[PDB]
Amino acid sequence: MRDAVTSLIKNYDITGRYLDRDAIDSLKSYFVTGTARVQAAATITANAAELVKQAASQLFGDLPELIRPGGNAYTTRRYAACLRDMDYYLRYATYALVAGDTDVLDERVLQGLRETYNSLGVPIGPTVVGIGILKDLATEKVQAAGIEVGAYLEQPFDHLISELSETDV
């Protein structure tokens, strides 16, 4: 949608300037990590259909308060819908990992997500834990794949946490 390149375009377009020395060195900082971005995005989709299955069984073994008849993950009508609604958070985290910033996450998944889940009774709470379990379970397959890891590939994920979850402090 809006790349880290194209975010730096309308960071410079609206002031009407060319590409100066700061433009030529911030953009080179994106390109030196681009080999590490793409190969991390391959191994995230190595077992991405397994990666949601290992996360949600580790979720629901951690919060039973979502299996026994309470909050909505009760039937397989809910549970297989939960695995799909989990799988969007894994799939859109692949895009913004390649795209540099989180503006793909900003206007594809985040907008309306506080208002979709409130209309259904889906809690926003364990969804943050569901991305928080996918926070480190994505870093394992990058680590076991030999990719270095760091803020890139561990950021898209907390931008799905710090902007989806409501501010307490």
Binding site: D3, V5, L19, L27, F31, G34
Partner: protein
């Protein structure tokens, strides 16, 4: 960019990132250091390109400069060099992005309605950017002038 265009196509089919667009993107990002030292030299010589293509346009189209044309007078022909200053400035955004969605969203999609509303001939700009291409291929080396010259050749197809 290409990286937006590879996501947005893969988002529409609602699959993951394919092995196809994993290698279009990886081949883009290992050419990323090559395109910025193309796009710096356009911005490093922006006062020469505008002056040379400004010298190259007005001898090709003397109906513009002559009175009763649109760019007539020293305030008006200073704006037509500013009118070409933007399109050189936009092309450097397209060389860095690897596509023309900086060109498309900023400098293409309403051009013919605007230039009809300003009085200028639309095809006279299409000669000028084509004259702007003929000084930009004399800057670069040969294997890069095919890459950066294609972004000039896209802008001709939007005008005419």
């Amino acid at each position: 960019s290409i990286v937006t265009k590879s996501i947005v196509n893969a988002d529409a089919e609602a699959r993951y990132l394919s092995p196809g667009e994993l290698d279009r993107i990886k081949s883009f990002v290992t050419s990323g250091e090559r395109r910025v030292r193309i796009a710096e030299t356009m911005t490093g010589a922006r006062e020469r390109i505008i002056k040379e293509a400004g010298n190259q346009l007005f001898q090709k189209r003397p109906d513009v400069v002559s009175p009763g044309g649109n760019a007539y007078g020293e305030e008006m022909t200073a704006t037509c060099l500013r009118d070409l200053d933007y399109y050189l400035r936009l092309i450097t955004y397209g060389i860095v992005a690897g596509d023309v969605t900086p060109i498309e969203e900023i400098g293409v999609v309403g051009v013919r309605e605007m230039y009809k509303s300003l009085g200028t001939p639309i095809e006279a700009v299409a000669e000028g950017v084509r004259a702007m291409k003929s000084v930009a291929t004399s800057l670069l080396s040969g294997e890069d002038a095919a890459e950066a010259g294609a972004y000039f050749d896209y802008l001709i197809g939007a005008m005419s």
